[PDB]
Amino acid sequence: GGLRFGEMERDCMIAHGAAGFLKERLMEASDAFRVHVCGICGLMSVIANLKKNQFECRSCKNKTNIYQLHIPYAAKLLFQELMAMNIAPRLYTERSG
Amino acid sequence: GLDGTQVERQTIDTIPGSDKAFHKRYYVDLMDEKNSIKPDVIEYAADILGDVELQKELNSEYEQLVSDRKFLREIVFVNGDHNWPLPVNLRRIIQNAQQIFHLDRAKASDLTIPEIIHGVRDLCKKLFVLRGENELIKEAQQNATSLFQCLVRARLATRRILEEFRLNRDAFEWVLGTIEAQFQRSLVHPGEMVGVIAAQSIGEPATQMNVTLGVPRLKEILNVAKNIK
Amino acid sequence: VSTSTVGARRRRAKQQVDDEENATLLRLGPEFALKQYDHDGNEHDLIALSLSESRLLIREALKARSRARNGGVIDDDELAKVTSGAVANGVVKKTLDYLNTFARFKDEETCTAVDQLLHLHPFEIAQLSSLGCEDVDEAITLIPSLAAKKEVNLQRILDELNRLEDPY
Amino acid sequence: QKKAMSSRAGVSQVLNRYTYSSTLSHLRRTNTPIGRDGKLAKPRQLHNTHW
Amino acid sequence: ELAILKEERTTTPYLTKYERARILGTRALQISMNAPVLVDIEGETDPLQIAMKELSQRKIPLVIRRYLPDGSYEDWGCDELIVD
Amino acid sequence: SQFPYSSAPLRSVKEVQFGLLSPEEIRAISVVKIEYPEIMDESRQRPREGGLNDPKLGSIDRNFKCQTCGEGMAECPGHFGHMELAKPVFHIGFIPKIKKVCECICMNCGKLLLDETNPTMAQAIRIRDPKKRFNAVWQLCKTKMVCEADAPKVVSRGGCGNTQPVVRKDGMKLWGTWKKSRDAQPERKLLTPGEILNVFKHISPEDCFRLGFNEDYARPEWMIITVLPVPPPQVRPSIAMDETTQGQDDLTHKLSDILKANINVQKLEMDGSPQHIINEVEQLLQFHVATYMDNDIAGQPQALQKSGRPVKAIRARLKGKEGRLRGNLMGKRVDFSARTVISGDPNLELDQVGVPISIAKTLSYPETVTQYNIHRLTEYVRNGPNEHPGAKYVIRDNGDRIDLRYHKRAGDIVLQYGWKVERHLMDDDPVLFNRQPSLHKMSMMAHRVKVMPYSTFRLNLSVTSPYNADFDGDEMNLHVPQSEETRAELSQLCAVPLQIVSPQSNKPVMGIVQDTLCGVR
Amino acid sequence: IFIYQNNITPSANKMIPTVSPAIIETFQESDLVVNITHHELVPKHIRLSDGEKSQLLQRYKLKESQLPRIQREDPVARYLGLKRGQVVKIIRRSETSGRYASYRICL
Amino acid sequence: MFFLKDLSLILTLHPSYFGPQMNQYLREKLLTDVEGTCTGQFGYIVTVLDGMNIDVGKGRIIPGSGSAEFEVKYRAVVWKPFKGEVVDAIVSNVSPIGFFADVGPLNVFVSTRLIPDNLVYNPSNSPPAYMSNDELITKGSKVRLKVVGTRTDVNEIYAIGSIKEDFLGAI
Amino acid sequence: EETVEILFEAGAAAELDDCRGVSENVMLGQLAPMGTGAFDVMIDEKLLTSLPADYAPT
DNA sequence: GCTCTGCTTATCGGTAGAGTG
DNA sequence: CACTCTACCGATAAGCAGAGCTACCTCTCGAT
RNA sequence: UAUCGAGAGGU
Ligand SMILES: Nc1ncnc2c1ncn2[C@@H]1O[C@H](COP(=O)(O)CP(=O)(O)OP(=O)(O)O)[C@@H](O)[C@H]1O
Ligand SMILES: [Mg+2]
Ligand SMILES: [Zn+2]
Ligand SMILES: [Zn+2]
Ligand SMILES: [Zn+2]
C-alpha cells in the first residue's frame, strides 16, 4: 500500500505554498484520470472512441464542442454518485459571471 | 505588511525616561556651548556654534522626536511598554557598521549635521510597503510604517549618531542602505497562505496546554458560546 | 481544432427545431447570425461577401503576403502558389478560377459603385451582386427572401448592376 | 447473529499468548461497556473503592 | 482590457519566494527538454543548476503574470524583477 | 502521458453549475433501459441485456472492451442507464423542501399565493440570492390559506378561489388538512407525489424565479422522481470472496429491489388490486428509492441486508471522515511514499535524512535523458532494479515502460534524448519528510537524501523539536517528488534550513538539545 | 429621532418605514444614559461622503460586497444614523504599525 | 457563399522551439494548419487575412509539461454552402448518372433525376454532353444550380445539386 | 461538514461554483491558486530575441 | 452519550377596532 | 363617549429532532 | 490479489 497524505498534510503544503507538489501528490502519485465532458451540457455523458477519433454527447446532439479534463478518479466517482441522486454537477471550462 | 519570520523585539527609545533624560539625549543647542555637540567628535566643530539656519534643522529633528514620543505615549502604548517585535534589527546594523568601518576611536567624524537629518528623513520615505501615488495608498503606506519610523528616528538622531555610535559618512550611508534593503526583505510575499499559518500557529500550542482558562475557554470563544462559565 | 467568436449555448430545458439550414428561409445556423462579434467583443453586422468582393480580398491578401515576405518589393496560378501546402494551393486555385469566371465587377471602381448602390439582409446583398439577373421575376425566385420586404427599385438595381457589369 | 448490532462486541477475545505474563493478565480482565462517545471522566477515574 | 500598463504597475518589484520556486522549476523542466539556454554551460549541467545560473544573470526567458483580486493583471519579466 | 491520445482540447474546470437532472435529460444521456432484476442472462454466463450489468453500461473486465465506447476498462468512464418508475415517488433529500413549496403555491392551479402588488412580497422578490429569496417568500405565503381570485371595479389576478391546506410531514408522506367552513370538520387527504408533480408543472416561469428555482437547471418538479438514473458498474463493482465466488455491491442489490418493487406496482393497477394493497406496494417503492439514496432517515427502520447490517446508501458514501470527500478527495493514499522507525545520528547534517538502501531501491525518480546525463543513466540501467545505484524502468516518449526486472539484454538498451529513466533514489535528492500529527508546517520539511545501511530513517538531533520526534518507536514518512517542478518547490520552499525561524512566534523552532546541550555547558 | 421610555408596539413600529423619504429612528431612553462612542474600545467612526466612498472602491478595485461590514443596528451605526450602502472610516490604534485605517460598509 | 469569419487556433509549442523566431514560426504554422482545410461548422477556410501581421499573443506555460499554449486569433475568408442556395458553377465531368460541377473549392453532383427531361445524355456527340434543342451542357459549360443537400466528411464536404427548377440550367 | 445537505441544496437552487477556493481545486486535481499557483507563467518572446539566429525554429 | 445551535410549534399578550349601552 | 368583544402581528419559550466528536501506523479474526 | 466489520496495539 501507499501512505495516506491526509487532510493535515494537505494543510501543511498549503502553508508552504507548494501548489505544484500538492497537485502532483494528489494526482500523478494517486488517482489521476482523464474524462471527456460536453461543452454544452457539462456532463460526463460523452461517448469517446479514441481510435476512431469520434466524440459525441448524444443528449445535446454534439460532436464538436467537447473537452478532456484531468481530474481525480474519486472526483469522477463523486460526480457520478451525485448524478445517481438526480443532481447535475456540470463541469464547464469557461466562466460567465 | 510584514512576514512573521522577520520581526524581533526592539526598544523604541523615545518612549521611556523623564522629560529631562529625553531632552538630554536628543536635543542639540548650537547656542549654549556646553549643550552643543562635543568638539572632539566632529571635524567641523568650529563652524557649528551660532548657526541659526542649522539650528532650524535640529529644531525640526527634535520637534519630530517630540511628536513621536507624544504619539507613542498617548495613542499607541499608554502603559509605557517600549519593547516590541519590529523588523530590521537596528542594534545589529550599527554594530556591524562599527566593525566594518573600524569606528573605534576617539576619531572625529566627517559626517555633517544636515546629512544626518536629511538622510534619515529621506530614508523614511523609501520604506515602501505599498507603492502608488494615489492619495489613499500614500496614507496607508504612512500608517503601515508609522511605528517603524519612530524606532528609526529614535536611534538615528543627530546627537546619538555622533556622540554615542560615532558613525562617519561612509558608515552612516551604509546603515541607511542596509535598513532600506532589510525592510524590503521583511515584507510578506504575495501568495502566502496566511490563513492556514494563522490556524496552525494558534492551534498547535493548544494541543500541548477563578476564571475559565485553557481549552474550555478557547472553546467558549471560538464557538461564540452564549452562556460562559 | 479551430474555433470562433460564438461560444456559450449551454443547455436549456426546451429544444429547438428552427435550426435546419435552409438558404431559402435565411436560416444559416448558429455561426452566421446577423450580429457577429470581433476578437475584442465589439458588436458587428455579419460580413457576407459577393463573388466580386471575395475576389478582391483574396487576391489582395495573397499578393500582400507575398510582398511582406519579400521585404517590400498578377496571374492567379502564380498568386495561389503563395499559400503553404498542396491542399491550400488546391482550394485557392480552384476558388480563384471560379471567381475569375463569375465575378461580374472585376475591379474596385465598379465594386464600390455596387457597394454604394446596395448600401436589407447581408446574405441577400451578396446574392444580388453574385447572381446576374434580367427581371424582378428571376430575382424573387432565386432569392425567395426578398418576397416580404416590400421595397424594390430592384429593377433599376438589376439594370444598373447589369450596366455596370463589364463585357467578357 | 441476526442482531449483531445492539449486541455487545468484544465479550469474547482471542487469548493473548505473546508471553506468559500477558496470558495471566488476559484471563483476569474486566470491561465497562460505556463507549467512547460522551467523554466525561468519572467512570474512567481510579475510584477509592477500587483499593 | 484586463492588462495593466507597465507605467501603472504598483506591485512589488522583487521576485517573490513563490515566483522564484516556480520559475526555477518550470525553467529546469524546459531545459531538460532541450530549450535554448541563454547562458554558458560549464561544469554544472543539472537542469536546476543551469536554471539557477540563468536566474543569477537575469536571463530566464519567462514572465510572471500577477493576477490582482479583480482579475486584472501585471506582466513582469524575470529580467526586470529584482533577485536577492 | 499514461493517457492515450485524444484530439479533444485539454482544459481545466473553471465553473461547476449545479442543478437537478430533469426526466427528459435522464433519458437523453442514457445508453440502455433497465427493466429486468435478474443480473445474469440465465446463470448461463454473460450479463442479461436490459439487466443491471448490461455491457452497454461499461466495461469493468480486463478482457472485454466497452460495448458503448469501445475503450478498455482503464479508459471507459462508465455510462448511465435509466429505469422508468411505474409511479412517481419523492426524492428523500427534498421532501422538506417540497413541503415548503406546497405551502407557497396554490395546490390547485400552481400560482404563487402572493403577488408583486403586495409591498412586503414585492420586497422579497428583490433578493438576489436564490436561497434567501425562497425563504423570504415562504415566510409570507405559508399563512395565506386561500388563492385570491381578485387583486386586493374588479381587477382579477388569475386566482381560482380555492382554500389552501395545512401541510404536515409524516415520514415519507405529506398530509394536507383543509378547514371546511364556524369550526366544522376538516378532511386531511394524502398529497401523493403524482398529485404534487402535476401541480408543480403548472408553476409559471415567472413564479419559478420568485421561488428561487431555475427554469433551465433546477425546475421544482424535478424534485419528484419519475425516472431513475442507473449508475454504471464503475460506481458499484462486484467483489470475489474466494476466487470463484462473487457478490454484488449494496447499490446493485438495492437497485434490484427498486426494480422488483417497480414491477409489483405495474402488476396491481392492471388486475388483482385490493386497494389497501395498492397503497402498501406503492409505499414500498417509495421506501426502496428513498433508502437507496439515504439510509439514515430519522424515525423509521433502516433498510437491511440479509446479513443483518444496514445498507450502504449513496449518502453514507460521501459523508464523514472516511467518506468520498475527506477520505478520497481532501486526502488520499499516494505512490512514492515510505515509512519506517526513526533513529538519531550525530554525524548527519541538519537538512539530511538517512534512507535505508532497501527503501532507496524501491523508490524512484524519473530523470529525463539528455546529452549531459545519458552516460550516467545507462550505468544505472545496467545495474538494474536490485543494485544501487540502479534503475527500475525506462520510459519512452510514447509512454511505454520497459521493466528492467524482466529485460535480460539490459546492456543492449540505448537511451534516446527525451526518454525518462526511473532511477533509484540517490544522495542529495530532495524528499519531503513528515511526522504525524502534522500540527504545523515544519511537521513536513524537505531533506537531502543520504543512502545508508540498516533499516531506520536517520535524523539530525536538532530537527527532532519541530517534528516532536524522538526514538522510542516513533515512525516517520517520506515522499519523493516526481518532477523538476516539484523537486524545486521542496528544495526552494520547504527545505529544513528555510524553516529554522517560524512565523508562529518570530523565533527559531530548532536548537541545541540533549547530549550536545548538556555537553556544551 | 423618537426617544421612548419602555417600549414601542410592533404595530406602531410599522409606521416607521411608511414615511419616506423622511427617516424615523427610535432609541430607548435608557440606552442613551451613557454615550458609548466615548468608550476606550470604540475608535472614532467617520462617515465617508459619496465621493470618498467611490474613491475607496477604486483604490482597492472593490465591489461593495467585498468590504468588511457593520450592521445597521450596530450601536455606532445607530449613533451616526448610517443607512444601507454608507461607509465609515475607522482610524485605530495598532501594536504593529501604530495606526491602521479600517473601513466598514453598512448593511 | 463567402464570408469573413473571426477564428482562432490553439497552438502548443514544445520548449525546443523557444527561440528567437518563435512568433514568426507560429504565424507560418497557423497558415500551414488552417488554409485549405474544411469543417462542417465554418466551411472551407480559403485564405487568412493579413497573415504576416497576426498577433499570436503570449504563450502560457502549461504546469507540469513546460510546453507553451498560444491562442492565435485571426480573420479569414471562408466558404460554406447551404441547402437552398443558388450558385453558378463549371461542369467538370458528364456521365450517364448526371454531371459534376465545380463551385469554387468543392464539387457538386447533379443526378439525372434532378435534370429536366428534355436534356438527354448523348455519348456519341463530340464532346459528350447533355443536349436538347437550344440547350447544351458539355464539360466547361457555365451552369446555374441550386444546392439541395450538403453532406459533411469534415475533410471535404459533399453537395448535391439540381437544375430541375425555374431559371436554373445552362447560361 | 454537512456534506450531502450542502450538495442537495446546491442542486435545488442551481448554485454556480466559481472554483476559486483552495478546496475546490484540490478536489478537482488542479493547481490551486496559492503560493506557487497564485500567478501564471508566460514565455518571454522579447527576451528570446537576443539569441543568435541559428537558434531559430525551422 | 454527551454537548451545542438552529429550526419548527405553542403561548402570550398586545393592541387595535367594531360593535355596545 | 366610555365600554366590552374578538381578528391580528409581535415576542416568547418550547420542544424537538439531528450534526459533530485528533492524526498517521501495525496485526489477527469472523462473516459474506 | 477481495469486501464488510470487530478486537488488540504503536507514536
Ligand atoms: N493518541 C495520540 N494522538 C495523537 N498524537 C499522539 C497520540 N499519542 C502520541 N501522540 C504523539 O506522540 C507524542 C507523545 O510522545 P510520548 O513519547 O508519548 C511523550 P513526551 O511528552 O514526548 O515524553 P515523556 O515520556 O518524557 O513524558 C504526542 O505529543 C504526539 O506528538
Ligand atoms: Mg516517542
Ligand atoms: Zn451535452
Ligand atoms: Zn464505455
Ligand atoms: Zn389557485
Question: What subunits touch chain A, counting only 3 or more CB pairs under 8 A?
Answer: B, C, E, F, H, I
Is A96 inside any structural domain? no
Answer whether H29's CB lies under 8 Å from H56's CB: no
Residue E4's nearest CA partner among E84, E69, E59 is E69
Backbone φ and ψ for G45, nearest 5 degrees, come out as -90, 130
The residue whose CB lies within 8 Å of the most ligand 1 atoms, and thus the one to mutate among F436, F443, F513, is F436
Report the 10 Å Cβ neighbour count for C149: 12
Question: How far apart, in whole angstroms, are the C-alpha atoms of residue A67 and residue F7?
Answer: 9
On whether the CB atoms of residues F249 and F237 are closer than 8 A, the answer is: yes
Same domain, H77 and H89: no
> CA(G32)–C1'(K2) in Å?
38
Reading the block at residue F267, the C-alpha cell is 402488476
Contact A69, A91 (CB under 8 A): yes
All cell numbers assigned to E2: 484586463
Pocket of ligand 1 (CB under 6 A): F 437, 468, 470, 472
Q: What strand order describes the sheet that includes I16-17?
A: A90-92, F15-17, I16-17
- For H22, the 3-state DSSP assignment is helix
Nearest CA residue ID for atom 4, ligand 1: F437
Query: How many Å apart are CA F482 and CA F495, to the nearest integer?
Result: 16
C-alpha cell at B2: 510584514
Q: Which domains does chain E have, with CATH numbers?
A: 1-84 (3.90.940.10)
* Mutation choice for H interface testing from I40, I43, I58 by most H CBs within 10 A: I43
Experimental method: X-ray
Cα dihedral E68, E71, E74, E76 in deg (nearest 10): 80
Contacts of A24 (CB under 8 A, 6+ apart): F481, F482, F483, F485, F486, H64
Whole-number Å distance between alpha carbons of A51 and A74: 26
Number of CB atoms found within 10 A of residue B92's CB: 12
Check which CATH number belongs to the domain holding G93 and give it.
3.90.940.20
For the CA of F435, the nearest ligand? 1
Q: In which residue ranges of chain C is CATH 1.20.1250.40 found?
A: 49-168
> CB–CB of I36 and A18 under 8 A?
yes
Distance F186 CA to K20 C1' (A): 42
For residue H89, the one-letter residue type is: A
The C-alpha atoms of residue B50 and residue B144 are separated, in whole angstroms, by: 39
Terminal-residue alpha carbon distance, chain H: 20
Q: Which three cell numbers stand for residue B105?
A: 576611536
Looking at the fold, whether H76 and H100 belong to one and the same domain comes out as: no
Give the ligand 1 atom nearest the CA of B208.
Answer: 29
List of residues 6+ apart from B90 with CB closer than 8 A: B10, B151, B152, B155, B179
Tracing cell 478546496 back to the chain, one arrives at I23
Do at least 3 CB pairs under 8 Å connect G with H?
A: no
- What F280-284 contacts at long range (C-beta under 8 Å, 24+ apart), as own/partner pairs, is F282/F87, F283/F172
Task: Report which secondary-structure segment, H or E, holds F337.
Answer: strand F337-344
H or E stretch at F507 = strand F507-508
For residue G79, the enclosing domain spans 35-107
- Same domain, yes or no: H91 and H77: no
Tell the residue nearest (CA) to atom 29 of ligand 1. F468
- C-alpha grid cell for residue G52? 470618498
Residue F355, beta-bridge partner list: F451
Q: What is d(CA H144, CA H162) in angstroms, rounded to the nearest whole number?
A: 9
Q: Are the C-beta atoms of H57 and H11 separated by less than 8 Å?
A: no
Q: What is the CA radius of gyration of chain I?
A: 21
Of G99, G103, G107, G106, nearest to G60 by C-alpha is: G103
Distance CA F74, CA F71 (A): 8
Closest CA relative to residue H3, chosen from A63, C100, C8, C45: C45
Q: How many angstroms separate the CA atoms of F244 and D11, rounded?
A: 34
Burial of residue F407 (CB within 10 Å: 0-12, 13-18, 19+) is middle
DSSP secondary structure of G12-68: HHTTSTTSTTS---EEEGGGGSS-GGGSTTSPPEEEPPHHHHHHHHHHTT--GGGS-
* C-alpha cell read off for H13: 509549442
Between CA A86 and CA F219 the distance in angstroms is 12
Reading the block at residue F79, the C-alpha cell is 455510462
Cα→Cα distances F41→F54, F55, F63, G67, Å: 10, 12, 19, 64
Q: Helices then strands (H, E): number in chain A?
A: 3, 6
- As a rounded value in angstroms, the CA-to-C1' distance for G26 and J16 is 21
Count of residues in chain C: 168
> Which among B151, B156, B186 is positioned nearest to B171, based on CA atoms?
B156
**Which of B85, B163, B179 has the alpha carbon at shortest distance from B126?**
B179
Question: Does residue F392 sit in helix, strand or coil?
Answer: strand
- Cα distance between residue B208 and residue F257, in whole Å: 52
Measured distance CA(E17)–CA(F422) in Å, rounded: 29
Task: Classify burial at C144, counting beta carbons within 10 Å of its beta carbon; exposed 0-12, middle 13-18, buried 19 or more.
Answer: middle
d(CA H65, CA C121): 49
Q: How far apart are CA C28 and CA H78, in angstroms?
A: 14
Say if A94 falls within a structural domain. no
Q: Which ligand is nearest to the CA of F31?
A: 4
Grid cell in block for residue G79? 449613533
**Alpha-helical segments (H) within chain C:** 51-69, 76-79, 86-100, 108-118, 122-130, 136-142, 154-164
Say whether F143 sits in a helix, a strand or coil.
coil
In this complex, which residue's CA is closest to the C1' atom of nucleotide L7? Answer: D10
G101 Cβ partners below 8 Å, 6+ apart? B139, B140, B143, G89, G90, G91, G92
> What span, in angstroms and rounded, lies between the C-alpha atoms of A71 and A91?
11
Would you say A23 and I29 are in contact if contact means Cβ atoms under 8 Å apart? yes
DSSP code of residue F33: B
- Ligand 2 mean position to F499 CA, how many Å? 22
Residue whose grid cell is 447533379: H110
B158: number of Cβ within 10 Å = 22
F312 sits within 7 Å of strand L by its CB: yes
Residue E76 parent element (H or E):
strand E73-77
- H6, C21: Cβ pair inside 8 Å? no
Judging by beta carbons within 10 Å of its beta carbon (0-12, 13-18, 19+), is residue B72 exposed, middle or buried?
buried
Domain extent at residue A24: 1-85
- Please name the residue that has the C-alpha cell 430545458: C13
Q: Are G50 and G97 in contact (CB under 8 A)?
A: no
Contacts of F316-321 spanning 24+ positions with Cβ under 8 A: F317/A81, F318/A78, F318/A81, F318/I3, F318/I4, F318/I7, F319/I3, F319/I4
Q: Which of E17, E22, E68 to mutate to test the interface with B (most CBs of B within 10 A)?
A: E17
Which grid coordinates are listed for B142? Answer: 504612512
All cell numbers assigned to F467: 517534528
* A17 to B193: CB separation less than 8 angstroms, yes or no: yes
**Dist. CA F176 → ligand 5 center (Å):** 15
- CA of C148 relative to ligand 1 center, distance in Å: 89
Tally the C-alpha atoms within 13 A of residue F408's C-alpha that lie toward its C-beta: 0
In which residue are the cell numbers 450538495 written?
I7
The residues, any chain, with a CB within 8 Å of residue B14's CB and separated by 6 or more, are B22, B26, B65, B68, B69, B72, B150, B153, B154
Q: Is B45 exposed, middle or buried (0-12, 13-18, 19+ CB in 10 A)?
A: middle
d(CA B129, CA B142): 9
In a shared domain, residues H46 and H87: no
Q: Which residues of F58-96 are buried (b: 16+ CB within 10 A; e: fewer)?
A: bbbeeeeebbbbbbebebbbbbbbbbebbbbbbbbbbbe
Which amino acid, F193?
P
Last residue of a domain, one of H34, H57, H82: H82
Are F258 and F230 in contact by the 8 Å Cβ rule? The answer is no
Alpha helices in F107-232 (DSSP H): 119-124, 130-141, 193-201, 205-210
Cell of H88: 453558378
Closest Cα to residue H67, out of H141, H12, H115? Answer: H12
Query: Which of H60, H34, H59 is closest to H47 using CA atoms?
Result: H34
Task: Give the one of F368, F370, F485 whose C-beta lies nearest to E26's C-beta.
Answer: F485
**Residue F521 in grid coordinates:** 555547558
| SS3 state at F418 | coil
I46 CA: distance to closest CA in chain A (Å): 27
Supply the angle between the helices C154-164 and C122-130 in degrees, to the nearest 10.
50
Number of domains comprising chain H? 2
For D28, the grid coordinates are 483476569
Nearest Cα residue to A78 out of F234, C77, C84: F234
Q: Which CATH class is domain C49-168?
A: mainly alpha
- Do I16 and F212 lie within an 8 Å CB cutoff? no
Tell me which chain A residue has its CA closest to the CA of residue C3. A65
Residues from chain B that touch A20, judged by Cβ atoms under 8 A, are: none
Distance, in Å, from the CA atom of G56 to the CA atom of B137, rounded to the nearest integer, reads 10
The reply, when asked if residue F76 is annotated as ligand binding, is yes
d(CA F461, CA F354): 12
Spatial CB neighbours of F142, under 8 Å, sequence gap ≥ 6? F103, F104
**Cβ(C110)–Cβ(C166) below 8 Å:** yes
Residue located via cell numbers 474555433? C3
C-alpha cell at F49: 441485456
Q: Name the one residue in this structure whose C-alpha cell is 427498486.
A: F258
State how far the Cα of A96 lies from the Cα of H77, in Å rounded to an integer.
Answer: 29
- d(Cα F54, Cα F233) in Å, to the nearest integer? 9
CA distance C16 to C105: 40
H touches which chains (3+ CB pairs under 8 A)? Answer: A, C, E, F, I
Among residues F104, G100, G39, the alpha carbon closest in space to that of B144 is found at: G100
Residues H50 and H110 in one domain: no
Are the C-beta atoms of residues F474 and F342 closer than 8 Å to each other?
Answer: yes
* D20 grid coordinates: 506468559
CA distance A20 to I32: 8
| d(C-alpha E23, C-alpha F323), whole Å | 37
Backbone angles phi, psi at C155, to 5 degrees: -65, -50
For strand L, list residues 427-486 of chain F whose Cβ lies within 7 Å of it: 436-437, 470, 472-475
The resolution in angstroms reads: 3.0
Instruction: Name the burial class of residue G85, with classes exposed (0-12), middle (13-18) and buried (19+) by CB atoms within 10 angstroms of its CB.
Output: exposed
CB-CB neighbors (< 8 A) of H18 in chain E: 30, 35-36, 61
Q: Determine contact, residues B11/B82, Cβ cutoff 8 Å.
A: yes
User: What is the rounded radius of gyration, in angstroms, for the C-alpha atoms of chain B?
Assistant: 22
Identify whether the C-beta of residue F305 lies closer than 8 Å to the C-beta of residue F253.
yes
Cβ count near C9 (within 10 Å): 12
Contact (CB<8Å) B143/G59: no
Residue with C-alpha cell 448461463?
F44
Q: Compute CA distances G38 → A43, B11, G30, G32, G45, whole Å.
A: 60, 31, 16, 12, 11
Task: Examine residue A90 and state whether it is found in any structural domain, yes or no.
Answer: no
Q: Which residues pair with A79 in a beta bridge?
A: none
Contact of B151 with B62, CB cutoff 8 Å: no
Q: Which residues surround ligand 4, an ion (CB under 5 A)?
A: F 58, 66, 68-69, 76
- DSSP string covering I1-58, please? --HHHHHHHHHHTT-EE---SHHHHHHTT---SSGGGSEEEEE-HHHHTTS-GGGS--
Q: Are H26 and H8 in contact (CB under 8 A)?
A: no
Phi–psi pair at B122, nearest 5 degrees: -70, -30
Please tell me the distance from the alpha carbon of residue G38 to that of residue B89, in angstroms, as a whole number.
38
The set of cell numbers assigned to E44 is: 554544472
By the 8 A CB rule, do H80 and H3 touch?
yes
Question: Residue type at F317?
Answer: R
Q: Is residue A92 one of the residues assigned to a domain?
A: no
Q: Is the Cβ pair A20, E18 closer than 8 Å? A: no
Residues of chain B contacting residue G44, judged by C-beta atoms under 8 Å apart? none
H64/A24 touch (CB, cutoff 8 Å), yes or no: yes
> Hey, what amino acid is at A45?
S
Residue with the three cell numbers 442543478: F19
Using DSSP, state whether D43 is helix, strand or coil: helix
Q: Which three cell numbers stand for residue F78?
A: 462508465
Query: What's the structural domain count of chain A?
Result: 1
Determine the Cα angle at C118 with ends C113 and C121, to 5°.
150
Partner residues linked to B26 by β-bridges: none
CB G67 within 8 A of CB G107: no
* DSSP structural state of residue B161: I
- Bond from prior residue into G21 cis (ω within 30 degrees of 0): yes
Q: What CA dihedral angle connects F324, F326, F328 and F329, to 10 degrees?
A: 100
> What whole-number distance in Å separates Cα of residue I27 and Cα of residue F323?
13
Strand ranges (DSSP E) for F357-436? 364-368, 391-395, 401-403, 420-424, 430-434
Query: In this structure, are residues H58 and I43 in contact, taking their beta carbons and an 8 Å threshold?
Result: yes
CATH number at residue A72: 3.90.1800.10
Residue-range definition of the domain harbouring residue H167: 83-171
Please identify, among H33, H51, H82, the residue that sits at the C-terminal boundary of a domain. H82
H/E segment holding residue E64? strand E62-67
Q: Find out whether A61 and A88 touch, Cβ atoms under 8 Å.
A: no
Q: How far apart are CA G98 and CA F228, in angstroms?
A: 64
Return the closest-CA partner of residue G96 out of H137, C7, B12, C32: B12
Instruction: State the burial class of residue E25 (Cβ atoms within 10 Å of its Cβ: 0-12, 13-18, 19+).
Output: buried
The H-or-E segment that residue B84 falls in is strand B83-87
Atom of ligand 1 nearest to the CA of B207: 29
Q: Round to whole Å and give the CA distance between A10 and F434.
A: 12
> Residue B143: which of B157, B129, B155 has the closest Cα?
B129
- F419 vs chain E: nearest CA distance in angstroms? 10
- Picking from H56, H82, H108, the residue at the C-terminal end of a domain is H82
- Strand pairing category for H120-122 and H106-111: unpaired
- Separation between Cα atoms, residue I44 and residue I58, nearest integer Å: 19
Residue D10 near residue D16 (C-beta atoms within 8 A): no
Measured to protein CB atoms, the chain J nucleotides within 7 Å are 1-2, 4-5, 8-9, 14-16
Nearest residue, CA→C1' of L3? F239
- Using DSSP's 3-state secondary structure scheme, residue H17 falls into helix
- In total, chain I counts a number of residues equal to 58
